[PDB]
């Protein structure tokens, strides 16, 4: 071996080695206090993280307007009880709202006979409504009932009366909230006498019953000065207007149309929708329909969609249908009036299995809106780009940043995005791995360069880049 | 007498691996219902694994355990590589993971939704390590009388996950677990990403192999030691499943993958007072995982030096107190080298690959000792077709983990291939370098003088 001895060591060890054994024993114990104070200084010099805002249920996800119950599932199975079977489909969409149509037995312009407390017998009863609310509560889907009283007449809110129709609504606020609906909507508030002071009485009883309730109000006013006069008294009101219903096919228009709305309201919580009760197939063609679903799901606010929006259900395609309430295309026999009129991709059954369809873009965007912290309440900072295109950054404190580049032109335009107009906390690097794109033909997950970004016509692409230093 | 022995096995198996694993099991298996299968399959494999280790402990009984079983079957080369890995790879990176767990869990209340600093974890984990090796070297009676303090912490913490878990079972909080229809997630992970969920599911079960040869004190073995395995290790799998059910009744599975500390994200919910005792009762559990792994790190430097390998400057024992200094100074230098480099969850894949690789060659040694050398007195036996289930599970996991992450397993096999030149310099060398061999004598006596340590009597 290599031993010395026990006894031979102690007569040879430590004549002056005891000086080096004490001095090196303190050099360890002094460097450990330098490693202890040097590890508390790093924690304090590490800055902070931001406190998460108090998120309500409509802040996290999208709502889903269901106008006509009989046309959502079909005239054979059209009931409130038949709506319960489709709750498994909407939970795949990961929507959080169920803003269903008014069901309060209107009598076609007779103010004394439209009681808002009593459900129409053509839809069901009281007992199937609460079990619909009990069934939706297990899947965490919130049901919003709207109380626009004259919904089958040519003008809502009963133009011959000014006061009895108003207290007909106010009595029904404390009636349906007993049954536990999680909000209310009032469409067409442009046809009201003293509209901006009647929402403030209705948002009292909606918030005063419980804090987790909401009120939605719909106009058709597309002017900026009319909307802000409605939001100058109330603040926590979702107002779905017709503000974006114009063309916006030039790129610098919609950049100047969206960033004027957040700048005038002071970056509050808004709701992004192209209309109040109309689909996205109106107001814009079918090649920009995948470009707006990427825009509406990434803007700061609650995106509101109508039924048949995820599949691009055009009312002007199938003949013999009312324009406001088209039939939802469930299977090949969902429209049994004209045989041989629907395609395979023009059906929610064929849209589901196609990995490059339009429903596959909705479902792949709806989960990333609902689960990602930088899209839930991340800051919005749009910046300049080339001749016509829209580009903006969604960013939060430390989370995964997002960068959307939307091209509204028709030529294969290069992006040319300049990062000089950003704050230093959320600047972009040279590489950012792609996440999704509207038209396929790009390698997803591949980190591409952000200076040479050649873009196709009608091609909006979603990139992400991590927090760096 | 058996009930006293069952506590010996469950006490050292259950440590701070239940606090690290369920983020990495859920990330690699995808769904919640597939992750609860992984904790059941791994616990059955450990029962199969700790059975075939008990048969070699009654057939060829020698001190050293895992290292001496390979020493009997091609024991020249293969026996040294079992100990070359357990000195550089296994024992350092088992302490660095538990040390990095300690800094990650005390810096979850501070910095709850942001990220902790990248060098505030490499310096707070090196403080738990460098303090404990100072405690460990010193009067070893101190190092065991403090270990039942850390054992009370992991019993207080794992009880609180259970009793607050079972309260949420008798409520409406059984949404994600009990429904059995919420079992869908990212399926682009292949089978090869489920193989990485077994590299991290058995980090929580690790520490079963060097226990069974210690239970020697047992009464009448050859029937009991076994009867003890069939009671202890399925009682670990009962706890690890029930404490993982309680993790998902508190938070979302996507919420579980975001936090760096799973046990205290549980604690910031379900009461307001458990924000104070969820970091404390789990940072105590990570103190015992490093303190309990610096006892057993020095028992392997003893068995290696008396057999030719591992030159005799190691395995020396201090003159006033029975403590090995230079065996603890090699698992403290080599642990700091593994600590500053890489990420914790990809360090478990670095252990669990090479830990399975020598798990197999001892069970393969249990079958080749039945082909070669029969009629040896064996007090207990298993089925002939029983350890070939373990070799079936070992082969289908090793080649799939090499396909998934080849870089973290390519450096695990690169250090084993570094073993064959240092072994051939080790014992197959002619002793004609007179100018080089007295360097070893000069290296020893200077280490024997600046440290007063001496070889033991035997
Ligand atoms: C801290 C700096 C950053 C980290 C750097 C790594 C530090 C590793 C330290 C590990 C923990 C050390 C604990 C020492 C105290 C033990 C406590 C105790 O019970 O003492 C008993 C015993 C008490 O002695 P007594 O007071 O005489 O009774 O302590 C000793 O006898 C010696 C203590 C000092 C040990 C000297 C170690 C010198 C290492 C220098 C290496 C130089 C290069 C070598 C190259 C080799 C190439 C192969
Ligand atoms: C740092 C901790 C200090 C306290 C502990 C001191 C430990 C010192 C040795 C550490 C390594 C222990 C394992 C040694 C290898 C074991 C294999 C074996 O069986 O050996 C038996 C063999 C014979 O032992 P014997 O039976 O006791 O004579 O022991 C040795 O030959 C030890 C050789 C020391 C060097 C090991 C290999 C170093 C690799 C790096 C080479 C660098 C080349 C020069 C580069 C430039 C330098 C300027
Ligand atoms: C309901 O809204 C009104 C404002 O529209 C709030 O203020 C009340 O206003 C009425 C006159 O319209 C006064 O008679 C009340 O005394 C006011 N209430 C006060 C000062 O507390 C009213 O606070 C709202 N209700 C709740 C519960 O907040
Ligand atoms: C909102 O819809 C109405 C219905 O067509 C538009 O027309 C208004 O209709 C009411 C009642 O029929 C009249 O009292 C108004 O004078 C009409 N407006 C105009 C400008 O003539 C109304 O224009 C639509 N709102 C917007 C902003 O286009
Ligand atoms: C939109 O935001 C900009 C700055 O963020 C502000 O616009 C300023 O409006 C005043 C009004 O006369 C001009 O004098 C300034 O030159 C404008 N600023 C810039 C940079 O052009 C304002 O906060 C918002 N605009 C409005 C009309 O409120
Ligand atoms: C579903 O796919 C079919 C492909 O067969 C599309 O049909 C083509 O549509 C374009 C105009 O959109 C026509 O110019 C082609 O002649 C059509 N081809 C055939 C074979 O009919 C159809 O447009 C797709 N559906 C939707 C809603 O876009
Ligand atoms: N070191 C063991 C695992 C391990 C050690 N200590 C632990 C404590 C608890 C859980 C697991 C462990 C291995 O390499 O497999």
Numbering used by the authors:
A (entry chain A): 163 to 631
B (entry chain B): 41 to 498
The authors write:
The l-type amino acid transporters (LATs) mediate neutral amino acids and thyroid hormones across membrane. LAT1 or LAT2 are the light chains of the heterodimeric amino acid transporters (HATs), which are composed of a light chain and a heavy chain.
The cryo-EM structures of the LAT2–4F2hc complex incubated with Leu or Trp were determined at 2.9 and 3.4 Å resolution, respectively. The cryo EM maps of LAT2–4F2hc + Leu and LAT2–4F2hc + Trp are very similar to each other. The overall structure of LAT2–4F2hc revealed an inward-open conformation, with Leu or Trp substrate binding to the bottom of the inner pocket of LAT2. Interestingly, the Trp substrate shows a triangular star-shaped density in the map, into which we assigned two binding positions for Trp. In position 1, Trp exhibits similar binding mode to Leu, while in position 2, the α-amino and α-carboxylate group of Trp mainly interact with the TM3 and TM10 in LAT2, forming hydrogen bonds with Asn134 in TM3 and Asn395 in TM10, respectively. To validate the binding modes, we introduced the N134Q, F243A, and N395Q mutants in LAT2 and set up the counterflow assay. Results showed that the F243A mutation had almost no transport activity. The N134Q and N395Q mutations remained ~20% transport activity compared with wild type (WT) in the [14C]-Trp and Leu counterflow assay, or remained ~15% and ~40% transport activity in the [3H]-Leu and Leu counterflow assay, respectively, suggesting their important roles in the transport cycle of LAT2. We propose that the Asn134-binding and Asn395-binding state might represent an intermediate state of substrate recognition and transport during an alternating assess cycle. Actually, the corresponding residues for Asn134 and Asn395 in LAT2 are Ser and Asn in LAT1 and ASC1, which are capable to form hydrogen bonds with substrates, suggesting the putative dual-binding-mode described here might also exist in LAT1 and ASC1.
